[PDB]
A paper describes a structure:
The TEC family kinase, [name] (Bruton’s tyrosine kinase) is best known as the target of ibrutinib (IMBRUVICA), the first-in-class covalent kinase active site inhibitor used to treat chronic lymphocytic leukemia, mantle cell lymphoma, Waldenström’s macroglobulinemia, and chronic graft-versus-host disease. The TEC and SRC kinases share the SH3–SH2–kinase domain arrangement (the ‘Src module’). In contrast, [name] contains an extended N-terminal region ([name]–PRR) consisting of the phospholipid-binding Pleckstrin homology (PH) domain followed by a Tec homology (TH) domain and a long linker housing two proline-rich regions (PRR). Membrane-induced dimerization activates [name] and we present here a crystal structure of an activation loop swapped [name] kinase domain dimer that likely represents the conformational state leading to trans-autophosphorylation. Together, these data provide the first structural elucidation of full-length [name] and allow a deeper understanding of allosteric control over the [name] kinase domain during distinct stages of activation.
The crystallization construct used to capture this new conformation of the [name] kinase domain included mutation of Y551E to mimic the phosphorylated activation loop, mutation of L390G to disfavor autoinhibitory contacts, and dasatinib bound to the active site. The kinase domain forms a face-to-face dimer in the crystal with two intermolecular interfaces; the β3/C-helix loop in the N-lobe forms one interface and the domain swapped activation loop and G-helix mediate an extensive interface between the C-lobes. The activation loop of one monomer in the face-to-face [name] dimer structure extends into the active site of the other monomer but electron density is missing for residues 546–559, which includes the Y551 autophosphorylation site. Nevertheless, superimposing two different substrate-bound kinase structures (tyrosine and serine phosphoacceptors) onto the [name] kinase domain shows that Y551 from one [name] kinase domain monomer would easily reach a viable phosphor-acceptor position in the active site of the opposing monomer. The swapped [name] dimer structure may therefore represent a conformation along the trans-autophosphorylation activation pathway. The canonical Lys/Glu salt bridge with active kinase domains does not form in the [name] kinase domain dimer due to the unusual conformation of the phenylalanine side of the DFG motif (F540). The F540 side chain intercalates between the Lys/Glu side chains adopting what has previously been termed ‘DFG-up’ or ‘DFGinter’. The C-helix is therefore held in an intermediate state between the C-helix in and C-helix out conformations associated with active and inactive kinases, respectively.
Residue numbers in the entry:
A (entry chain A): 392 to 545, 560 to 659
B (entry chain B): 392 to 405, 407 to 545, 558 to 659
Write the structure that this text describes.
Amino acid sequence: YGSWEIDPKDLTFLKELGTGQFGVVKYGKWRGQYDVAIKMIREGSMSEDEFIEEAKVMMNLSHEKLVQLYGVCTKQRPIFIITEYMANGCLLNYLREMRHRFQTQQLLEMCKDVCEAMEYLESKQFLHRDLAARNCLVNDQGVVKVSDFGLSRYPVRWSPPEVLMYSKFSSKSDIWAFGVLMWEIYSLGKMPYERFTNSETAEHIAQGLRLPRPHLASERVYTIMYSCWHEKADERPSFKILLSNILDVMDEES
Amino acid sequence: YGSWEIDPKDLTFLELGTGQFGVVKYGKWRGQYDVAIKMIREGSMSEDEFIEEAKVMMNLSHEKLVQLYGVCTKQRPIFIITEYMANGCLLNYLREMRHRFQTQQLLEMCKDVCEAMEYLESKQFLHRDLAARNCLVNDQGVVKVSDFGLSRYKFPVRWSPPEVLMYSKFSSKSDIWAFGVLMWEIYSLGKMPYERFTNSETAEHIAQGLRLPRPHLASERVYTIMYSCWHEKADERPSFKILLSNILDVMDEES
Ligand SMILES: Cc1nc(Nc2ncc(C(=O)Nc3c(C)cccc3Cl)s2)cc(N2CCN(CCO)CC2)n1
Ligand SMILES: Cc1nc(Nc2ncc(C(=O)Nc3c(C)cccc3Cl)s2)cc(N2CCN(CCO)CC2)n1
């Protein structure tokens, strides 16, 4: 893959952070000077072609609020993926572990960080398959960033109208999820619809039920997350507009 | 994978076509049984993808479904053996025999595809690409669908919008629309849907509420079936259990 291929002997496995479906992440050090995260992909988790597309996306996309790629080790099995290390780890556990210790003005900065990354992927026609607090990482300075792994891109004469319409306004799925994310941040890791099941939630949202307003979220902040929860997808805002609305509130409140 | 394991030497590679995941050839088992062989590429699928595909191939069976004869998992490229379809694709079969069909044969074909889908519907399986080009015909003129590359019905209910949850509840209604157009291909003798419109014009043509015109070979009652498959509201469309329910009724009426 060129310069992206790194030397394995320069790595050093030290600790374990977690395990996923497409491998296991392990904490290490690059040349014993910088902290990095290393993911060990399983032999049969993904196909060859699937890795070329996934990799091709990680090298061509770059944003300050996206998990930076340090390199990969495709010259061995299992293959590695070296990236920057996030000291604080997951955002969900971060909101619950360090709960109510950061003031409200910091909560909105977390939404801005995620909105900045999504706005970038939006400009590149990329969709987050699972946008939620559990899929966001926090670094030492409290910056929230999303990942590039597992991203998506965006029969005509045999497909129904429901499929055609979705193929043109599918980007609005990441907007609804983002709205529920702000709810998780301002609720400090509260699970959406705690008093409802999966079947219930699907029925309540269909009837118009929306998440309450976090007590730590101002009435204007609620307008942002609530703007993302519009029945008509085309009536929902874009990540560029949401970023402007978030920045607008930050200036008026801070 | 057990008894499903076939000896690559027992099969002889006597070519039929090629797909994304590999190429399909023609052969015979022990010089006595006819079957088709699929040589999947090395990097097209993953180990987990195959195990799921196979697990679905070996656990499903239906007369109108492509029967699986076996696989060769101790070989690279991995092989998948199935029954041989003398007449091959349905679209080419409708165009090569356009002058050699009866009105009862056309409706019989539609049943052969509906009977298969009805079985898939009961097992919660979905055909991602249901069309005449993905259907095969054996020597006796019986149509059969394939179960390779199917999908079942993750979506986080708590973070998904309504259009996604509503899609997961009416996912089988999408194949109904495709089935309705399939019947048009049959009674139209292989004509391309919206042959006089482009991909962008077809999408708008459906948005305006217009649909395919009735083929002259289809009767008023048969067209009502395929037309019922094309309803703006997915919930208002019938089910494959109901389509077969009707197709048989029009058969007895016109037979
Ligand atoms: C799960 C976890 N992640 C951490 N930081 C990460 N940085 C980079 C990671 C990563 O997975 N990148 C990546 C991606 C995104 C895709 C493909 C490939 C790769 Cl390599 S993960 C830290 C952490 N700890 C901190 C919070 N607790 C401290 C209390 O002791 C405990 C746990 N936990
Ligand atoms: C493309 C083609 N298929 C033919 N029969 C097949 N039987 C089994 C096939 C197969 O694909 N199974 C399968 C599936 C479904 C999934 C995964 C894996 C597998 Cl293995 S295909 C015959 C044929 N010929 C007949 C019609 N023409 C001569 C007229 O004189 C020429 C062409 N052409």
